Amino acid sequence: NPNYCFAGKTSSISDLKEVPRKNITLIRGLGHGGEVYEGQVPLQVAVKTLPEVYSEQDELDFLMEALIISKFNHQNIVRCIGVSLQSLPRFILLEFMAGGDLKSFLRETRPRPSQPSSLAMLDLLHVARDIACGCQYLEENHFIHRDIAARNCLLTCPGPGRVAKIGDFGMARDIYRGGCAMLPVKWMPPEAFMEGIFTSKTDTWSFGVLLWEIFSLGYMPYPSKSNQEVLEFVTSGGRMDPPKNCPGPVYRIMTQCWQHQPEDRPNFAIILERIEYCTQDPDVINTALPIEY
Ligand SMILES: C[C@@H](Oc1cc(-c2cnn(C3CCNCC3)c2)cnc1N)c1c(Cl)ccc(F)c1Cl
């Protein structure tokens, strides 16, 4: 079995905490991709399954992801409860995030003529703060996520106490051990998609796009552009306009995240400071979010 190194320590799949199959119950499907369920171990879990029809490479990839997540220790990264590997299909057990993924949440929770104050600017800033905090943790432990995006973030619950966490590490796992049309190029900086260069400044760019996802309330980035057009657009200096009703201080963070040169972009410590200043500015957090009719 493969070895993984994070922080100063080196681990092995054998080190994954095994949960006996008999203690695990599958309650319902959670919209599968492999399949994902809500489960109980009483501990409420999310269960990620490895399809049995998959081969050998996928099997190691699958466990590698549990190993990667298991070695993190931070409040804004989803916890791995353990694995169940001594029965088919293979299970990975994760902290259950009742709020679901961030993109769906945003789309489904957009203020309406009936619920105009469902979400406010401060809620968005706190989600952005949560994830920036997870990213800072990754950056200072020299881990590059490579796929920061709303679809890969989770919320603890729907309501006001919600905490956002980074949840999917499949891209990081892949590069660790494939096609053009499966690369998240709309979240990637030029040096990333042109040269395959990835640094912590790679994630800073992606976080800027996520910001935009957050303050658009779940729109797909670069609306009405294809990947190839975005690639040519961004390479040419093109950048997205502000989401609707987006305060200038928030947009300004996005545009700094999208500086063409990696060394001109902020590290996550700087992004956090700037996000916190936004939570202090009444002209930011008193701004009304748009309503779709
Ligand atoms: C692997 C899977 O794990 C979870 C899914 C979910 C989830 C998905 N959907 N829902 C809904 C359950 C019913 N109520 C609304 C949310 C919960 C919660 N916690 C998880 N750890 C997952 C998914 Cl499906 C999507 C994005 C992610 F970043 C992750 Cl990490």
The reply to whether 290 falls in a domain is no
Nearest to 222 by CA among 233, 236, 237: 233
Q: Are residues 58 and 18 in the same domain?
A: yes
SS3 category, 77: strand
Q: Which of 61, 101, 147, 168 is catalytic?
A: 147
Q: Are residues 124 and 87 in the same domain?
A: no
Q: Containing domain of residue 51, as a range?
A: 1-96
Q: Are residues 60 and 190 in the same domain?
A: no
Nearest to 145 by CA among 165, 170, 172: 172
Pocket lining for ligand 1, CB < 6 angstroms? 30, 36, 46, 48, 78, 94-97, 100-101, 152, 154, 167-168
How many whole angstroms from 30 Cα to the centroid of ligand 1? 7
Q: Where does residue 64 rank: exposed (0-12), middle (13-18), buried (19+ CB within 10 A)? A: buried
Q: Which atom of ligand 1 is nearest to the CA of 153?
A: 28
Q: How was this structure determined?
A: X-ray
Q: Which residues contact 17 (CB under 8 A, 6 or more apart)?
A: 70, 81, 82, 83
Rg of the chain over all Cα atoms, to the nearest angstrom: 19
How many whole angstroms from 100 Cα to the centroid of ligand 1? 4
Rounded CA-CA distance 153/145 in Å is 12
Instruction: CATH number of the domain at 40, please.
Output: 3.30.200.20
Q: What is the DSSP code (8-state) at residue 24?
A: -
The reply to whether 288 falls in a domain is no
Q: Are residues 143 and 74 in the same domain?
A: no
Are 80 and 70 spatial neighbours (Cβ–Cβ below 8 Å)?
Answer: yes
| Amino acid symbol at 80 | C
Extended beta strands in the chain, E state: 3-6, 9-12, 25-29, 36-40, 44-50, 80-84, 90-95, 100-101, 153-155, 164-166
Residue from 27, 30, 166 whose mutation best tests the ligand 1 pocket (most atoms within 8 A of CB): 30
Q: Which atom of ligand 1 is nearest to the CA of 151?
A: 26
Q: Where does residue 66 rank: exposed (0-12), middle (13-18), buried (19+ CB within 10 A)? A: buried
Do you know the residue count of the chain? 293
| Amino acid symbol at 276 | E
How many whole angstroms from 101 Cα to the centroid of ligand 1? 6
Are 41 and 23 spatial neighbours (Cβ–Cβ below 8 Å)?
Answer: yes
Rounded CA-CA distance 150/219 in Å is 10
Residue from 36, 78, 79 whose mutation best tests the ligand 1 pocket (most atoms within 8 A of CB): 36
Rounded CA-CA distance 35/143 in Å is 27
Rounded CA-CA distance 119/110 in Å is 7
Are 133 and 99 spatial neighbours (Cβ–Cβ below 8 Å)?
Answer: no
Instruction: CATH number of the domain at 180, please.
Output: 1.10.510.10
Rounded CA-CA distance 285/102 in Å is 20
Rounded CA-CA distance 122/40 in Å is 33
The reply to whether 26 falls in a domain is yes
CB atoms within 10 A of CB 250: 24
Rounded CA-CA distance 35/251 in Å is 36
How many whole angstroms from 102 Cα to the centroid of ligand 1? 9
Rounded CA-CA distance 153/134 in Å is 10
Nearest to 254 by CA among 98, 128, 101, 130: 128
How many whole angstroms from 78 Cα to the centroid of ligand 1? 10
Q: Which atom of ligand 1 is nearest to the CA of 96?
A: 19
Annotated active-site residue 147? The verdict is: yes
Extended beta strands in 51-181, E state: 80-84, 90-95, 100-101, 153-155, 164-166
Listed residues 69, 96, 123: the one ending a domain: 96
Q: Which atom of ligand 1 is nearest to the CA of 168?
A: 28
